[PDB]
């Protein structure tokens, strides 16, 4: 009991740790390594405790010390079962769920990928301290690539991996009707978002018949001013000049700039 006490204040705070370690004085050796700020020392203690202590005992010691916990966590990411065990026993369910999501991104098929997402959702259930969003998100993710798989089977093009917005964009650009509206409806994409995507897609498609058809209605959730600007560049100044004066909320001084840049001097 005495031999441990005398080392607690001298000398080089880096050679007291191997001495503490041989005396089976763990934690104290780890605390001294942490307070030294020496990464090399912290690893040496962790690697020693990893091989000597049971994983359970190893976790407890390491979990109490955020710096030591970080290194074990860092070493495993570059091990997977170790990460899950660490997070579960420390009740870190969001971190554990992230491991399964990270595994889903590595699955060669969406079937196996969605199975990994399901495992992530399982972790977030129980206790569930405000995990409603993540559970719905993993639900959408499983929903999305399942629909995108149908598109690849039918349209013989690539869709799996794109976001909801990117999926809508590619669908509209290829002129695939309400298939994009089906995606939009299923994922509850806001009106202002969906119309920006549709505007950008039709412009990049130069589908000025559809744009003119869209101009043939009254209200616009994003306004008609975006329609003016988007069509003017890389497109018709003539079709752009259609949206004026539908642009409700305007300058109001004056209107000239729009009629001016549309070639009509």
């Amino acid at each position: 009991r005495l031999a441990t006490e005398l080392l607690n204040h001298e000398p080089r705070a880096g050679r007291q740790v191997p001495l503490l370690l041989s005396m089976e004085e763990d934690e104290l050796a780890l605390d001294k390594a942490i307070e030294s700020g020496d990464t090399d020392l912290i690893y040496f203690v962790i690697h020693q405790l990893r091989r000597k202590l049971p994983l359970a005992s190893f976790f407890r010691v390491v979990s109490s010390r955020p710096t030591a916990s970080a290194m074990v966590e860092a070493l495993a990411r570059n091990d997977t079962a170790l990460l899950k065990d660490l997070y579960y026993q420390d009740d870190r369910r969001l971190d554990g769920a992230s491991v399964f999501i990270r595994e889903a991104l590595q699955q060669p098929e969406t079937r196996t990928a969605s199975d990994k997402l399901d495992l992530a959702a399982n972790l977030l259930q129980g206790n569930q301290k405000e995990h409603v969003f993540e559970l719905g998100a993993l639900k959408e993710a499983k929903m999305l690539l399942r629909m995108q798989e149908t598109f690849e089977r039918d349209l013989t093009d690539s869709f799996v991996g794109l976001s909801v917005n990117q999926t809508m964009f590619k669908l509209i650009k290829l002129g695939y009707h309400g298939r994009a509206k089906k995606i939009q409806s299923e994922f509850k994409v806001p009106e202002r978002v969906a119309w920006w995507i549709r505007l950008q897609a039709l412009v990049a498609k130069r589908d000025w018949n559809e744009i003119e058809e869209i101009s043939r209605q009254r209200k616009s959730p994003i306004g008609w001013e975006p329609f003016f600007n988007q069509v003017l560049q890389a497109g018709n100044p003539r079709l752009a000049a259609t949206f004026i004066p539908k642009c409700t909320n305007l300058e109001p001084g004056q209107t000239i700039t729009m009629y001016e840049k549309c070639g009509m001097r």
Binding site: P11, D40, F44, N78, T110, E140, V193, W196
Partner: protein, 574 residues
């Protein structure tokens, strides 16, 4: 007799060449890729050739030249990736050559017990001459020192790896070993305190067994000022508005170089006369600056080609700043920074996501929201998170979680998001910087400031003064800082005196430790510094030119995009 950034380069240059001659004969050189950049700052490839270097190679490329016998590896010691790579490089040549081949390894800056094991558990340890290359600070400029740890922000704040703090402490201690102890160690932030604690511990360990002499205070160094990056996330999150700042934003700058459209490499340092004047200037006057220079030349050879280079660069940056997306980004940034209701900027953010603006730019806005408003309202939070997921991928469920761990994107109901107040009792040892309080108390918003002839550091953001630099002014320019708020404020003592109430509302511990012609002050950034903060420091350095020399030290040169990339998941469900 004082400190000089050139002696750092000189020491770094002779430390390497001494080791390159330690290996007798000719040699092939294999270097860690992200180390090759910083190495170019201290030594040219021509000089290395004059010391027996045949060909150059990269560690990650795994194709070491079989040519010369001597195979010299140069990499960072604390790296886990490198220890396996070199071992796998030896295996992939010890049984894949024809001649004996000698193996030399130059660790930076030290040989680690970890690297000993990795080579031990590979068997290739016995066949290697291990040498130590004490490289720390890379003098990018005469007034800028950098450890060049381009992953230090991620490691320190996301991975909680204390390695950059330890390396910075050794680098700072190295200066004390030569020029004497820092009379004062002034700082703000948890990692700033950790550096101060290490300087104290390393000092007392230097007394060791066998007793050593000890160190006396410096007579050429005034003090050291240490600022933790996590104290002010807002500044780097904003879009930099200086010329060099916008280059870093648009093109990206690494090792005093950038890539404009394989691609052409443009040198960006103070050696160029024209760039020395352009780099710190607000971009709004660059065009006029370029016009004046061009007219003077037609009315001293490299300046002619430099005029063409920066006319091309500026023209591209101008084209980028004219886009609706850019101005929309600035609009949200300015409103949030000014103090407007964050909820009013929702439709603009929603539009930007809808227009598919680059993810980092969107995340920077969300983090600016969270970091400046003390978290995000619960109802708006899920709406923001939903936009990101279905706008860029559900994979970014990890990205948002990482930003949460970084405490840069939090709910208002979260205890980690709460800003420091004096009304809401105590609670929260890691309560965040109160920008609402600090905006007024430190004049973070200056809508005056002309950009043709700036009168305040707020010119680097066209009206916004960086909190980080404002805290530096609490120590260095107390009279001026009071002047822009008070007036009639002996007077010139060090420390946080006069502003202790204000700094109290900033994140992390506040400290001012006393260790027992003009002098130099070291302004140290732990976690990264932006070019705007550098430009702000240079502005101040010009004002203090007669009384102080200012040298900037940092772990790396950081920006908004580098911070988001520390969190952004790149795998994409394909």
């Amino acid at each position: 007799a004082g400190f000089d950034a050139e002696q750092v380069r000189d020491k770094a240059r002779k430390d390497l060449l001494h080791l390159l001659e330690g290996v007798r004969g000719k040699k092939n050189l294999v270097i860690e890729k992200d180390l090759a950049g910083p190495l170019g700052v201290i030594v040219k490839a021509s000089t290395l050739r004059d010391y027996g270097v045949d060909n150059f190679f990269f560690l990650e490329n795994k194709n070491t030249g079989t040519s010369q016998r001597n195979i010299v590896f140069i990499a960072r010691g604390e790296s886990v990736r490198n220890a396996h790579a070199i071992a796998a490089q030896i295996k992939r040549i010890q049984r894949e050559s024809q001649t004996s081949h000698d193996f030399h390894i130059f660790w930076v800056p030290r040989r680690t017990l970890f690297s000993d094991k990795v080579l031990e558990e590979a068997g290739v340890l016995g066949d290697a001459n291990i040498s130590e290359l004490p490289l720390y600070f890379f003098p990018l400029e005469r007034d800028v020192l950098s450890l060049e740890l381009n992953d230090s922000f991620r490691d320190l704040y996301l991975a909680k790896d204390p390695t950059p703090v330890f390396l910075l402490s050794r680098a700072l201690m190295g200066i004390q070993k030569k020029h004497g102890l820092f009379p004062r160690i002034i700082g703000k932030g948890e990692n700033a305190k950790r550096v101060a604690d290490l300087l104290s511990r390393m000092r007392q360990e230097l007394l060791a067994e066998s007793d050593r002499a000890g160190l006396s205070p410096s007579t050429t160094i005034e003090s050291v000022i240490i600022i933790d990056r996590e104290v002010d996330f807002v500044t780097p999150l904003l879009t930099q508005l200086t010329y060099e700042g916008l280059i870093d934003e648009y093109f990206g700058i690494q090792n005093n170089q950038t890539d404009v459209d394989r691609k052409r490499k443009i040198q960006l340092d103070g050696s160029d006369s024209l760039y020395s004047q352009l780099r710190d200037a607000n971009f709004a006057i660059v065009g006029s600056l370029l016009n004046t220079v061009a007219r003077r030349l037609k009315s001293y050879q490299a300046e002619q080609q430099s005029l063409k280079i920066h006319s091309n660069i500026a023209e591209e940056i101008i084209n980028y700043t004219r886009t609706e997306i850019f101005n929309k980004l600035l609009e949200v940034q300015q409103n949030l920074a000014a103090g407007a209701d964050p909820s009013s900027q929702f439709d603009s953010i929603e539009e930007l996501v809808a227009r598919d603006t680059p993810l980092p730019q969107v995340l920077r806005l969300l983090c600016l929201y969270s970091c400046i408003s003390g978290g995000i309202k619960t109802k708006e939070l899920d709406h923001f998170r939903r936009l990101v997921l279905q706008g860029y991928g559900h994979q970014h469920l990890l990205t948002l979680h990482n930003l949460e761990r970084l405490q840069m994107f939090l709910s208002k109901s979260s205890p980690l998001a709460s800003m420091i107040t004096m009304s809401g009792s105590s609670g929260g040892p890691d309560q965040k910087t109160n920008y609402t309080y600090l905006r007024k108390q430190l004049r973070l918003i200056v809508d005056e400031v002309n950009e043709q002839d700036p009168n305040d550091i707020a010119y680097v953001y066209s009206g916004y003064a960086p909190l980080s630099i404002r805290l530096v002014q609490c120590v260095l320019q107390k009279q001026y800082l009071l002047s822009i708020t008070k007036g009639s404020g002996g007077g010139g003592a060090q420390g946080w005196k006069g502003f202790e109430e204000i700094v109290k509302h900033a994140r992390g511990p506040t400290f001012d430790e006393i260790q027992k012609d003009k002098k130099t002050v070291f302004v140290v950034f732990v976690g990264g510094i932006t070019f705007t903060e550098i430009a702000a420091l240079r502005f101040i350095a010009k004002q203090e030119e007669a009384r102080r020399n200012i040298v900037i030290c940092t772990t790396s040169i950081i920006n908004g995009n580098r911070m988001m990339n520390a969190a952004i998941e790149t795998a994409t469900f394909e």
